[PDB]
């Protein structure tokens, strides 16, 4: 009848995922999101399977990168919890906004 304290398992996951390289977003859901968006620029499109993978890789490398800068912004404000405000500042300094 035991539990790990808040954050212990979090650190454990940081360690696991920083060690691996597998894509972290489920494939099907992603392929579905991709085609939906594309459908708005041109209808009835077909995608090489590798084109969808390239997209998922870029997209996941971008988010992982964005979460690093966001973590830094949150720590800057003496917090340990990231918030929309942190993603906002990071994207602002990066000049994405």
């Amino acid at each position: 009848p035991h539990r790990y304290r808040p954050g212990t398992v979090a650190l454990r996951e940081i360690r696991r995922y920083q060690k691996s390289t597998e894509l972290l977003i489920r494939k099907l859901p992603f392929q579905r999101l991709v085609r939906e968006i594309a459908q708005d620029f041109k209808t009835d499109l077909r995608f090489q399977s590798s084109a969808v993978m390239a997209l998922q890789e870029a997209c996941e490398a971008y988010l992982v990168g964005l979460f690093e800068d966001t973590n830094l912004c949150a720590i800057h404000a003496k917090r340990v919890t990231i918030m929309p405000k942190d993603i906002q500042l990071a994207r602002r300094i990066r000049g994405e906004r």
Partner: protein
């Protein structure tokens, strides 16, 4: 007739580099040494990365270099990291790194 690579003492295709410069619309004419020089530069950088990725593999008890290994060699090298700072290596993940303030104790 011996290849320009062997003559330049390279493993990289001087002939191909020359054809690629001529057809890439970079300039109207291309000197004979430019393909040689360029090919040497490309070979050297290629050896630099393979050398470090080979090491990264060995430090992993692996003999086949994979994407993760190329990522560890690059991000763990100040100069290579700067050169590829805006490049993303598919299937290479990220360097293990946890901000101090996030550790327990």
């Amino acid at each position: 007739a011996k290849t320009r690579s062997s003559r330049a003492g390279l493993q990289f295709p001087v002939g191909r580099v020359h054809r690629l410069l001529r057809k890439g619309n970079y300039s109207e004419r291309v000197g004979a040494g430019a393909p040689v020089y360029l090919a040497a530069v490309l070979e050297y950088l290629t050896a630099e990365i393979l050398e470090l990725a080979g090491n990264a593999a060995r430090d992993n008890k692996k003999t086949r270099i994979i994407p993760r290994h190329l990522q560890l060699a690059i991000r763990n090298d100040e100069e290579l990291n700067k050169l590829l700072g805006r490049v993303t290596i598919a299937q290479g993940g990220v360097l293990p790194n946890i901000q101090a303030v996030l550790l327990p104790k």
